Design an enzyme around this catalytic site. Sequence first.
Site, PDB file in Angstrom:
ATOM      1  CB  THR A 249      -0.556   0.369   1.226  1.00 49.84           C
ATOM      2  OG1 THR A 249      -1.970  -1.190   1.104  1.00 49.84           O
ATOM      3  CG2 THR A 249      -1.330   1.468   1.637  1.00 49.84           C
TER       4      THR A 249
HETATM    5  C1  U47 Z   1      -1.294  -6.467   2.224  1.00 46.68           C
HETATM    6  C2  U47 Z   1       0.025  -6.431   2.872  1.00 46.68           C
HETATM    7  S1  U47 Z   1       1.443  -4.947   2.229  1.00 46.68           S
HETATM    8  O1  U47 Z   1       0.261  -4.301   0.950  1.00 46.68           O
HETATM    9  O2  U47 Z   1       1.071  -3.071   3.151  1.00 46.68           O
HETATM   10  N1  U47 Z   1       2.727  -4.423   1.773  1.00 46.68           N
HETATM   11  C3  U47 Z   1       3.419  -4.340   2.748  1.00 46.68           C
HETATM   12  C4  U47 Z   1       4.810  -3.523   2.062  1.00 46.68           C
HETATM   13  N2  U47 Z   1       5.266  -4.306   1.147  1.00 46.68           N
HETATM   14  C5  U47 Z   1       6.419  -2.704   0.569  1.00 46.68           C
HETATM   15  C6  U47 Z   1       7.391  -2.316   1.546  1.00 46.68           C
HETATM   16  C7  U47 Z   1       7.967  -2.908   2.467  1.00 46.68           C
HETATM   17  C8  U47 Z   1       8.185  -2.624   3.648  1.00 46.68           C
HETATM   18  C9  U47 Z   1       8.989  -1.685   3.800  1.00 46.68           C
HETATM   19  O3  U47 Z   1       9.982  -1.125   4.426  1.00 46.68           O
HETATM   20  C10 U47 Z   1      11.558  -1.391   4.462  1.00 46.68           C
HETATM   21  F1  U47 Z   1      12.226  -0.397   4.827  1.00 46.68           F
HETATM   22  F2  U47 Z   1      11.633  -2.373   5.030  1.00 46.68           F
HETATM   23  F3  U47 Z   1      11.827  -1.650   2.834  1.00 46.68           F
HETATM   24  C11 U47 Z   1       8.547  -0.663   2.852  1.00 46.68           C
HETATM   25  F4  U47 Z   1       8.818   0.992   2.265  1.00 46.68           F
HETATM   26  C12 U47 Z   1       7.583  -0.620   1.333  1.00 46.68           C
HETATM   27  C13 U47 Z   1       4.661  -4.630  -0.199  1.00 46.68           C
HETATM   28  C14 U47 Z   1       5.450  -5.470  -0.488  1.00 46.68           C
HETATM   29  O4  U47 Z   1       5.087  -6.419  -1.018  1.00 46.68           O
HETATM   30  C15 U47 Z   1       4.147  -6.595  -1.965  1.00 46.68           C
HETATM   31  C16 U47 Z   1       5.596  -6.164  -3.085  1.00 46.68           C
HETATM   32  C17 U47 Z   1       6.754  -5.866  -3.600  1.00 46.68           C
HETATM   33  N3  U47 Z   1       7.017  -5.441  -3.972  1.00 46.68           N
HETATM   34  N4  U47 Z   1       6.103  -6.053  -5.444  1.00 46.68           N
HETATM   35  N5  U47 Z   1       4.989  -6.087  -4.300  1.00 46.68           N
HETATM   36  C18 U47 Z   1       3.425  -5.466   0.838  1.00 46.68           C
END
Ligand code: U47
Lengths: 306, 301
Positions: free
Chosen positions: B137
């Site tokens: 998201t």
């Molecule tokens: C249903 C859960 S979600 O859609 O919100 N989700 C979590 C966020 N992810 C992106 C993300 C993860 C972690 C961080 O922090 C960090 F610093 F560690 F990177 C973010 F800024 C952003 C999503 C990723 O998962 C699916 C994906 C990945 N690439 N394309 N789709 C999921």
Amino acid sequence: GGFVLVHAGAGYHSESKAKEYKHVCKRACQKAIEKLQAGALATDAVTAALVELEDSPFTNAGMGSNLNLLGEIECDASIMDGKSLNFGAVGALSGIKNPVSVANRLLCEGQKIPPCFLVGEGAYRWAVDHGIPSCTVGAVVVDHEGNVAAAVSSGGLALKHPGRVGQAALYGCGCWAENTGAHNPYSTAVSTSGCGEHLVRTILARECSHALQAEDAHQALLETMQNKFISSPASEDGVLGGVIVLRSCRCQTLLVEFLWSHTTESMCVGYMSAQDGKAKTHISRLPPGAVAGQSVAIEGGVCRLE
Amino acid sequence: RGGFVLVHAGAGYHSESKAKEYKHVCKRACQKAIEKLQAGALATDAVTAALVELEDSPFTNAGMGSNLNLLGEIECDASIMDGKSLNFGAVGALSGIKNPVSVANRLLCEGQIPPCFLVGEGAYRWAVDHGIPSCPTVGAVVVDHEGNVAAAVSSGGLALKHPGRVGQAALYGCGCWAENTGAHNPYSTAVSTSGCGEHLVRTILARECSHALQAEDAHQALLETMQNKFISSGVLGGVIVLRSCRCTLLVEFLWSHTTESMCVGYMSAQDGKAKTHISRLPPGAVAGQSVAIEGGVCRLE
Ligand SMILES: */C=C\S(=O)(=O)N1CCN(Cc2ccc(OC(F)(F)F)c(F)c2)[C@@H](COCc2c[nH]nn2)C1
Ligand SMILES: C=CS(=O)(=O)N1CCN(Cc2ccc(OC(F)(F)F)c(F)c2)[C@@H](COCc2c[nH]nn2)C1
Ligand code: NA
Ligand code: NA
């Protein structure tokens, strides 16, 4: 023991059909009181009321819903359970006789992280894969133990764009149900009805449930309606809508306050206690010399149960 | 001509590999938002520009690269809210469209003002019929120099979700909220949420935060909302938040999350450097049972 309040719509007066709405509200209340008196859940009894109101050809819901821009029927519905705070909802659903049924099943599915809100073709296939027949109204309920449930189901605006989803499909807006809790001295249930492209922009059902935590319910709901429908709408016309409402508390006796209110030129409601089994109906009108959009009708009774 | 933006590219599990990617989209998104505010654009147009950039990142669960549903298709939720009019546009279970936030922003503009939410094929037909490019998201909040606010959120939802499943980023009150000062609000407030899962929708989180932030202490209001309304009915997710009021214009911003970590970016129009940050829970706190919160302030004309 139990109690049920239902409504078959808040909109333009129709003496023509005004007695058809009274008849369907009656059968909706009886259906709900049988279900309760057979020991079924509140959400089940509220879903029974709604199947009956939807099936009326005269109700903007289910059979008889307004046609969209494409001459098709696309439905919204939602239900919520007071004990669990779980919720079910369908948006833009086509070719299902009783949307509230999909919404209820989505809720019982969730009570066993399952989906709780499905729309369009997704909603349609899910509904058929769960055994539900193919091809605004509202109810609120309390059972003899104080469990409340609420539900709502609409055909939406006439000639609406395809896929357009309105208040009856949305968490907190179309309906709400919340059992007595640490911060709720009262168990409360709300089902709302919107009218025209002009529609309240609040979580109406949830707002009314919070408002009904004040001590004087009648004044409590009247001020909400004044604020949300008339008052808040800087340079817009009055919002046309209805709402039904009940709150309950224990004192081995259940006290049940119940109410309806609306700015439309009228609204037909229906109620019934399991104890007496007498199903009452009543067409509420606005008092003359009061044009719809800035007047608020409001009425209620109380009822003690065991 | 001035203002400030705050965006986030996700709240989830920590990934050192992907971490620097996330920092760079947040950086670009703020730069797209701030350029539009120097060029006289509206708040809603600035926050949409931010979201189109976050969306396009292959690494965000939104727009291109969104999670795949149970039929291996992409179905996107998105919405947007303007604080001055209180207008609102939203799409759910949307497919075949590159930037879902663009549709939701369009549904506002075409207005005139009445709220609007289109789902599925009908949302696609509306979009194609109104010029939005069909695809082969995250969220943002913003305030401009007169203190108008706006917010948006775009997500691709839960992996392998049933088709037609709609999530928090479509739902009024849940995914985002924006409200200028009035008689209920001494403050102009803007909120966008992150995470998926039902607990975002079940709590009307975005609107509840905005309501709490009318209190005096923003850090306490947010922290109360995350503990007393998120973690209490595991609960994963996040929000970003900003709030303005005249002294000239003071804007307090904050983020918070119960997930392992969350990538954000912020930026002022006066100051030319986009700050970027990965916010992580402290060692030995389990996600879903614990909360992190940080933020700053900024002064504008
Ligand atoms: C249903 C859960 S979600 O859609 O919100 N989700 C979590 C966020 N992810 C992106 C993300 C993860 C972690 C961080 O922090 C960090 F610093 F560690 F990177 C973010 F800024 C952003 C999503 C990723 O998962 C699916 C994906 C990945 N690439 N394309 N789709 C999921
Ligand atoms: C978003 C649309 S609506 O919910 O606002 N709406 C308003 C309500 N009427 C039903 C109704 C009218 C008056 C009532 O009270 C009485 F006092 F008797 F006149 C009442 F109880 C129900 C809907 C009529 O729709 C047309 C139709 C007919 N057959 N099928 N559809 C539409
Ligand atoms: Na009907
Ligand atoms: Na993406």
